């Protein structure tokens, strides 16, 4: 409990520190954006006298709350997001715990099924993600066996061989699972280099805010399944990298505790 | 460690589970979605009838403009900042816990860069805390189980845990947020499993004046509830390994 309460203080400090950085980075721009939206609404009310401010506000709120409740207030649709295609990809967000929220159960029966789907689906997916990580580790172990043979003849210390290997695993993994897919996302979704990198990190870390979702704007036939294949291998890579950071914090804490 | 033959077999199982799940989700949601998409069109048509000075393309531009502004971080309602220290502290929590509701998300270029670095070191930092909380909860349960003294103990851990971490908080959420019994249970599961869709977020309605102790008590429940759900999901994962080993022999 002494270590637990010490780690809890560290996390609270980290949360207050992060909360201050986020406020300073976002609040001035948010106040600027909230002024221009008010100006646009005021100019709309001037251009449409037959619409009162409370009627406009009711309409805007009604559209936002309907969109949040599962029904899109755009178009007529005689574009369903509950067809087998989008339903298969929604089921993926549940078992991967990414949960963007762009598609979510609105029916009472759908909410009951989603509870049971995560209960058995999340541990079922965890077994697959462990196997994908072992397959990626075996593929990296086969590639590293040729690199370590060159370093062995160059008299590099056995402990440093593992140090160079961990940096290579992180660098090569960041290329095929982070940069290469984000370049594709920039050229397809029309997102900036930063927004594409931000999407990759948020997706593969299972945070899934839902502000950026691949294949959402009203795409190629091969696009959606290739994105979800990248999710499967990318989650296993990010799990290994986040485990290395978690292990480095334990080694850093043990060295600091002794000194 | 795991052979490719077992990995490819487990991959087929997951694809079957995803296609099966998708079929259940389509049958449960598509008829209601078609019903909801008809009433939204009727509402828009009746609005255009009540406000002749607004053309359908102007109404559609306005609705799209409001949805895209809301999605970009700026709420088109009112004239209530969601980036104040209070809401920003709770947003930072959704990042390290990987829940990520998405109700609040970085809009500035600097905020997106900081959020990438915040998750990279914050997620493993939180994982160390969540492991310690799980050990403290296991030690508290081990002390209570010693007084009662394995099958009965596992059922007792699951049942008592479901009372204090799932039912008791959901009852409070129903009496505070105005959510139904099912919507409150759905919220608890989605939150404590780090899925975090964002459709239901505690302390989100502007109209209701929430208590001072409400928001931090929800985030304290998240801390202990995540550690409990990790233990339960690990038991289900272990159950599947024991079930697969028994079926492999037979």
């Amino acid at each position: 409990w002494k270590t637990v309460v010490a780690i809890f203080v560290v996390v609270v400090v980290y949360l207050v520190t992060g909360g201050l950085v986020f406020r300073a980075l976002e609040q001035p721009f948010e106040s600027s954006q909230k002024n221009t939206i008010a100006l646009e609404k005021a100019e709309f009310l001037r251009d449409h006298v037959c619409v009162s401010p409370q009627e406009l506000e009711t309409l805007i709120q009604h559209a936002l709350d309907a969109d949040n409740a599962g029904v899109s207030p755009i178009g007529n649709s005689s574009s369903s997001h509950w067809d087998l295609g989008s339903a298969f990809f929604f089921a993926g967000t549940v078992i991967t715990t990414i949960g963007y929220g762009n598609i979510a159960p609105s029916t009472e029966g759908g909410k009951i099924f989603c509870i049971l789907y995560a209960i058995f689906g999340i541990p079922l997916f965890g077994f697959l993600l462990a196997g994908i990580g072992d397959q990626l580790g075996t593929i990296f172990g086969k590639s590293i066996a040729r690199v370590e043979k060159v370093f062995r003849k160059k008299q590099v210390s056995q402990t440093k061989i593992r140090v160079i290997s961990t940096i290579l695993f992180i660098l090569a993994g960041c290329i095929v699972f982070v940069t290469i897919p984000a370049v594709i996302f920039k050229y397809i979704e029309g997102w900036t280099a930063l927004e594409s990198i931000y999407f990759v990190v948020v997706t593969l870390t299972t945070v899934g805010f839902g502000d950026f979702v691949a294949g959402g704007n009203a795409y190629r036939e091969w696009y959606k399944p290739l994105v979800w294949f990248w999710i499967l291998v990318g989650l296993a890579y990010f799990a290994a990298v986040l485990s290395m950071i978690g292990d480095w914090l334990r080694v850093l804490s043990k060295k600091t505790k002794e000194e | 460690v795991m052979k490719w033959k077992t990995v490819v077999a487990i991959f087929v199982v997951v694809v079957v589970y995803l296609v099966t799940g998708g079929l259940v989700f389509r049958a449960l949601e598509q008829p209601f979605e078609s019903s909801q998409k008809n009433t939204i069109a009727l509402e828009k048509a009746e609005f255009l009838r009540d406000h002749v000075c607004v053309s359908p393309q102007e109404l559609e531009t306005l609705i799209q403009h409001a949805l895209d502004a809301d999605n970009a971080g700026v709420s088109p309602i009112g004239n209530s900042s969601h980036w104040d220290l209070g809401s920003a502290f709770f947003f930072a929590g959704t990042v390290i816990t990987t829940i990520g509701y998405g109700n609040i998300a970085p809009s500035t270029e600097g905020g997106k860069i900081f959020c990438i670095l915040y998750a990279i070191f914050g997620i493993p930092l939180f994982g160390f805390l969540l492991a310690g909380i799980g050990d403290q909860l296991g030690t508290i349960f081990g002390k209570s189980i010693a007084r009662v003294e394995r099958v009965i103990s596992t059922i007792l851990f699951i049942l008592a845990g479901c009372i204090v971490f799932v039912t008791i908080p959901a009852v409070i959420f129903k009496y505070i947020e105005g959510w139904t019994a099912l919507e409150s249970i759905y919220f608890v599961v989605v939150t404590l499993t780090t899925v975090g869709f964002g459709d239901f977020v505690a302390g989100g309605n502007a109209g209701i004046n929430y208590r001072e102790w409400y928001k931090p008590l929800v985030w304290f429940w998240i801390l202990v509830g995540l550690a409990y759900f990790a233990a339960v999901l690990s038991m289900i994962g272990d159950w599947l390994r024991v079930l697969s080993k028994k079926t492999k022999e037979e």
Partner: nanobody, 112 residues
Framework: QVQLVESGGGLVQPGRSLRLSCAAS????????MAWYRQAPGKQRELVAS???????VYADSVKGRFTISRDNGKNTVYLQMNSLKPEDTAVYYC???????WGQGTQVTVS
């Protein structure tokens, strides 16, 4: 000073395509919603098309499937690709910053 410069209008044949452009300046173009309007001689101002900050497009029912609005944030220019022009499209086209009161000069497009 918000300035909207229009181009690409003029006399055209019915059925033939035409492209209007709008060089914008004096404001943050990336986050603003652009729109195109048309003033018919015997009619009032009519919204033709509108592209939001997230590149989502909204069109008038009369121009649906024929006209296409697109934005080039890199060059701060909003376009209106008018295809399969009918004599009913003969009107003065104005470039607008939707719900901000900023209008262009107006380019006469005549289809006959």
């Amino acid at each position: 000073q918000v300035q909207l410069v229009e181009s690409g209008g003029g006399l055209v044949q019915p059925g033939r395509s035409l492209r209007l452009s709008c060089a914008a300046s004096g404001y943050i173009f990336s986050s603003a919603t652009m729109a195109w309007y048309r003033q018919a001689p015997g009619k009032q101002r009519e919204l033709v098309a509108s592209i939001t900050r997230a590149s989502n497009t909204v069109y008038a029912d009369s121009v649906k499937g024929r006209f296409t609005i697109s934005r080039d944030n890199g060059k701060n220019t909003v376009y209106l690709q008018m295809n399969s022009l009918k004599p009913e499209d003969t009107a003065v086209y104005y470039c607008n910053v939707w719900s901000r009161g900023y209008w262009g000069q107006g380019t006469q497009v005549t289809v006959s």
